[PDB]
Amino acid sequence: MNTVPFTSAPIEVTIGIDQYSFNVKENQPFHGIKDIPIGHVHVIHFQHADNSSMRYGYWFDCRMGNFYIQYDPKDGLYKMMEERDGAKFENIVHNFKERQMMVSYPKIDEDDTWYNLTEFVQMDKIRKIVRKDENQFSYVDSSMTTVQENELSDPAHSLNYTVINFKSREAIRPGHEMEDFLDKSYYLNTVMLQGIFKNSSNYFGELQFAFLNAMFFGNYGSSLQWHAMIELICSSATVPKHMLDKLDEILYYQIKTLPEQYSDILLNERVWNICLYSSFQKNSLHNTEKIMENKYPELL
Amino acid sequence: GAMNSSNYAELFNNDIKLFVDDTNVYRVTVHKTFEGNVATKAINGCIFTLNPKTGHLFLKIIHTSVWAGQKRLSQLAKWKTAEEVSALVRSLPKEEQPKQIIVTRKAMLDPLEVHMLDFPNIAIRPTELRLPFSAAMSIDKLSDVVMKATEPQMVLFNIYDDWLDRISSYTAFSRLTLLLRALKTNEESAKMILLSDPTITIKSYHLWPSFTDEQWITIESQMRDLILTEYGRKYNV
Numbered sequence: 018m019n020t021v022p023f024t025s026a027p028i029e030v031t032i033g034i035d036q037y038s039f040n041v042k043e044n045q046p047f048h049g050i051k052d053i054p055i056g057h058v059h060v061i062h063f064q065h066a067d068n069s070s071m072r073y074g075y076w077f078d079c080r081m082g083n084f085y086i087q088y089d090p091k092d093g094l095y096k097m098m099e100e101r102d103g104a105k106f107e108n109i110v111h112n113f114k115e116r117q118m119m120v121s122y123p124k125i126d127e128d129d130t131w132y133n134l135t136e137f138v139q140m141d142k143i144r145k146i147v148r149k150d151e152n153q154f155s156y157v158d159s160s161m162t163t164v165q166e167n168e169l170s171d172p173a174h175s176l177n178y179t180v181i182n183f184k185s186r187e188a189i190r191p192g193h194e195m196e197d198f199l200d201k202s203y204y205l206n207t208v209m210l211q212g213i214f215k216n217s218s219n220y221f222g223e224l225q226f227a228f229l230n231a232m233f234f235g236n237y238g239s240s241l242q243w244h245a246m247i248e249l250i251c252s253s254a255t256v257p258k259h260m261l262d263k264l265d266e267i268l269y270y271q272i273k274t275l276p277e278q279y280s281d282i283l284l285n286e287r288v289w290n291i292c293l294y295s296s297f298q299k300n301s302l303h304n305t306e307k308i309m310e311n312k313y314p315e316l317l
Numbered sequence: 318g319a320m321n322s323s324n325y326a327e328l329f330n331n332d333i334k335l336f337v338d339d340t341n342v343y344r345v346t347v348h349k350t351f352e353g354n355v356a357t358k359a360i361n362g363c364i365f366t367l368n369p370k371t372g373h374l375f376l377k378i379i380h381t382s383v384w385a386g387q388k389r390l391s392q393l394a395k396w397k398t399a400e401e402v403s404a405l406v407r408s409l410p411k412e413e414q415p416k417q418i419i420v421t422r423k424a425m426l427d428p429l430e431v432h433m434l435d436f437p438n439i440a441i442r443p444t445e446l447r448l449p450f451s452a453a454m455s456i457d458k459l460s461d462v463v464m465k466a467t468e469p470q471m472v473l474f475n476i477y478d479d480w481l482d483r484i485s486s487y488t489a490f491s492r493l494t495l496l497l498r499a500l501k502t503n504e505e506s507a508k509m510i511l512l513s514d515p516t517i518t519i520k521s522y523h524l525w526p527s528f529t530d531e532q533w534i535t536i537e538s539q540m541r542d543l544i545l546t547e548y549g550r551k552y553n554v
């Protein structure tokens with residue numbers, strides 16, 4: 018079990034850790050989050066009481082260092098930082114626990130939600146999508162745009178998701194125009210899986226990370242990316258059986274976890290209706306189809 | 318963006334553009350089989366690719382052999398249209414290639430877009446106009462060459478005959494669309510109007526009769542009258 022201490026909490030903010038969140042008052046004695054499960058990525062995120070805009074936050078893995086949060090009154094946001102002095106850090110973390118000023122990561126033992134949402138998400142891949150190689154952790158916020166969005170303005174602050182485009186030369190072999198446009202299996206399996214992602218686990222990992230960014234920050238380009246990667250699979254006639262079964266599990270837990278009040282913007286009607294009811298894989302998402310019908314029948 | 322009444326004079330500027338109509342690419346007769354089921358028999362079709370400024374028509378004849386052994390033919394027709402349009406553009410010298418292609422039916426956008434990926438600077442556009450190019454097979458000489466074809470064939474025509482020696486492209490296109498609108502709404506009447514007078518002939522190298530300017534005015538009025546009557550009949554107004 019690992020800990021992320023907080024120097025202080027100078028401004029009223031709602032703090033989230035993975036799917037949990039806590040209200041903290043201006044200059045309340047909040048000094049961190051303890052008992053964070055080792056073995057997964059995590060995200061700690063923020064929404065100030067005064068600006069219900071710009072949700073922002075940090076992806077991290079505690080096996081990669083000792084990390085902590087400190088408010089910056091110049092830049093006006095809670096920043097994640099690394100403490101390189103291991104002894105100085107255990108010292109802070111033990112004094113704060115003794116004084117009992119830390120919340121406990123509130124995991125129910127029956128609950129695999131976070132595992133199920135992050136199964137294929139690797140910290141090393143996150144740091145290639147969010148390039149900032151002097152930190153071990155990754156900042157994301159509501160407003161960041163993706164590389165594909167940029168193409169159609171500051172690249173230092175971009176989400177470098179893999180560009181997917183159904184009407185591109187990449188996606189369409191000369192001479193197989195109609196075949197490849199109607200059956201994307203070659204784009205999925207040769208270009209994307211074998212070519213770029215190398216394996217389905219990296220593909221699933223980017224898909225899950227895009228969903229989580231859309232859920233926790235309302236990042237719109239991430240939502241576009243999550244939907245595009247679903248559609249590419251659902252629009253391929255030839256998909257490995259293990260991918261389809263795992264996709265059904267992935268999507269099930271994502272739909273399960275979505276806030277009910279956000280289904281309007283986070284769920285693209287056309288993609289879901291095409292994937293669940295018109296695509297080659299209409300019959301391969303039995304759990305995802307069952308939870309979508311019972312929870313959001315309007316969208317369908 | 319889409320083509321509509323507002324930006325209509327863009328068709329007659331000096332940017333090369335083509336209309337593509339696919340309505341007559343896949344053509345069938347429907348009949349009963351011995352066991353009493355319904356079956357289709359394909360006949361020869363055509364792609365109607367027209368430069369509205371110059372009248373040049375690229376009539377690509379679609380022979381029934383194209384369809385042999387193929388499924389989902391109505392879907393395939395759209396891709397074959399786009400394949401052939403893309404090959405036409407490739408065959409033209411660079412300075413003759415269009416800067417826009419306007420498809421008369423929205424279902425052609427994706428097939429043509431995909432086939433034109435090599436020409437990113439050719440814009441593919443839909444239109445909100447209800448153009449009557451389906452009636453192209455009501456022009457006797459076009460119907461004749463389509464039905465006689467024994468293999469795929471490209472036949473070139475000027476759909477305006479020599480009209481541009483005397484009138485503008487705008488006026489020429491309005492005449493063409495009026496004639497075709499009339500042929501579409503009541504082919505028999507429209508054709509009666511065009512040929513009633515045996516002393517006005519169609520030149521061997523032309524599609525329409527050699528009317529004088531004044532006779533075109535009478536003709537055009539007769540086509541207008543035809544079109545309005547048919548409307549009152551359709552809707553009881």
